[PDB]
Structure formats: C-alpha cells, structure tokens
C-alpha cells in the first residue's frame, strides 16, 4: 500500500535514483505560492557512492 520499488539494469545501478515531487491537492496553494517556489516540493534518493 505504501511501497515504491525502482529497479535498474546492471549498467544503471551506479547512481540509480528516484525523485519525489509532491504537489498540493489544492487550487489555492498552487495559486498563492507560485512565485515563492514552494508549492511543489522535490527530493531525491540515490545509491550512495560507497567504498
């Protein structure tokens, strides 16, 4: 119900990442914060460069 799964081939494993973009489910929030740039929020999860 709450799980997201990203699968990449062998060649795309290095730095395989997911970017989450959350948008308001509201018209007023889209309208009133278009200028400030805080009506949609994005973040990323990536495979760490590990030793």
């Amino acid at each position: 119900q709450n799980t997201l799964i990203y699968v990449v081939p062998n060649g795309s494993f290095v730095g395989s990442n997911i970017k989450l973009t959350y948008t308001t489910t509201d018209y007023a929030v889209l309208h009133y914060f278009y200028s400030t740039g805080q009506y949609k929020v994005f973040k990323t999860v990536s495979v760490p460069n590990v030793t």
Binding site: V41, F42, K43, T44
Partner: protein, 51 residues
Amino acid sequence: NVLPTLTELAAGNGTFTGSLQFTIVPNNTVVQIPSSLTKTSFAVYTNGSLA
C-alpha cells in the same frame, strides 16, 4: 551581471553549477637572454595574459 548565475542542482543540496571559459591573449614583456651564455641573444615576449 555578465557572470552566469550559479543554479543549484537540487533543493537544499548546496551544489551550484554554471559556466566558466578561459583563453590566452598575448601581451608584451621583454626578456633578454645574453649572448655571453648562448652566443646569440634572445628577446622573448612572454606568455601573455590569462583572460
């Protein structure tokens, strides 16, 4: 502002990317190599100027 504005690659990341080009514009600076050590004098205009 002729300098490009470094745009962040991600929200709250700390990495800002732009563009920086370089070239060499020759200038004048006389360097004298005496003939007492080479039998032929050398008047050398140096590298130039980094731009």
